[PDB]
């Protein structure tokens, strides 16, 4: 996809992450698990719900529409009525199908972007206290317990707190 994350450098999805569209998996001495990222999921749900509501708002309900009759000497106007009904139907079928295709493209890219931006936001918190090990994962250069994991997930990771222990580990190799 356009942003390279979904079916890209993060190869597959997680059936184990239930609470949202994007999020985290961790492993430390205490155990493993998944957690949705609430803020990124919420913002995505706001955009997508708005997108669907905009499609609905533009497409007005049809009110009463019934046929008309013509006698055997009104074929020209009968055909004109037909041309009008067919032509408007052609145009509305075209508009609906096309808007769906175009928006579906944009929807999958928006999700892709959102994953990319979450990856990059975490990378930028951890800096050189973690190494990138592919497939959307980071290995910390220090012990990271559940309180530490949660600090990453909520955007308050403390780089300086772990920088020395990280550096000693990073400089051992």
């Amino acid at each position: 996809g356009l942003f390279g994350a979904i079916a890209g450098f993060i190869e597959g999805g997680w059936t184990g992450m239930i609470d949202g569209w994007y999020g985290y998996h961790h492993q430390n001495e205490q155990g493993s698990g998944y957690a949705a990222d609430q803020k990124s999921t919420q913002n995505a749900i706001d955009g997508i719900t708005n997108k669907v509501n905009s499609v609905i708002e533009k497409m007005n309900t049809q009110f009463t529409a019934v046929g008309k009759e013509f006698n055997n000497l009104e074929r020209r106007i009968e055909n004109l009525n037909k041309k009008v009904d067919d032509g408007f139907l052609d145009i509305w079928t075209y508009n609906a199908e096309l808007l769906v295709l175009l928006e579906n493209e944009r929807t999958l890219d928006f999700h892709d972007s959102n994953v990319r931006n979450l990856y990059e936001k975490v990378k930028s918190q951890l800096k050189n206290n973690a190494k990138e090990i592919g497939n959307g994962c980071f290995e910390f250069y220090h012990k990271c317990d559940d309180a530490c994991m949660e600090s990453v997930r909520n955007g308050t990771y403390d780089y300086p707190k772990y920088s020395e222990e990280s550096k000693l580990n990073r400089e051992e190799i």
């Binding site: 996809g1 979904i6 079916a7 190869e11 597959g12 999805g13 059936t15 569209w21 997508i48 669907v52 499609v55 497409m59 007005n60 309900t61 049809q62 009110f63 009463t64 529409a65 019934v66 046929g67 009904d85 139907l89 509305w92 079928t93 609906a96 199908e97 769906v100 928006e103 579906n104 929807t107 999958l108 999700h111 892709d112």
Partner: peptide, 27 residues
């Protein structure tokens, strides 16, 4: 195409499914 009342808009389409979620890659 013929309707009385307040109806959805008539189109010739046989399928119109709009994505909300993302590409599904369970395995």
């Amino acid at each position: 195409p013929v309707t009385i009342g307040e109806c959805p808009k008539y189109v010739r389409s046989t399928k119109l499914r709009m994505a909300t979620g993302l590409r599904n890659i369970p395995s």
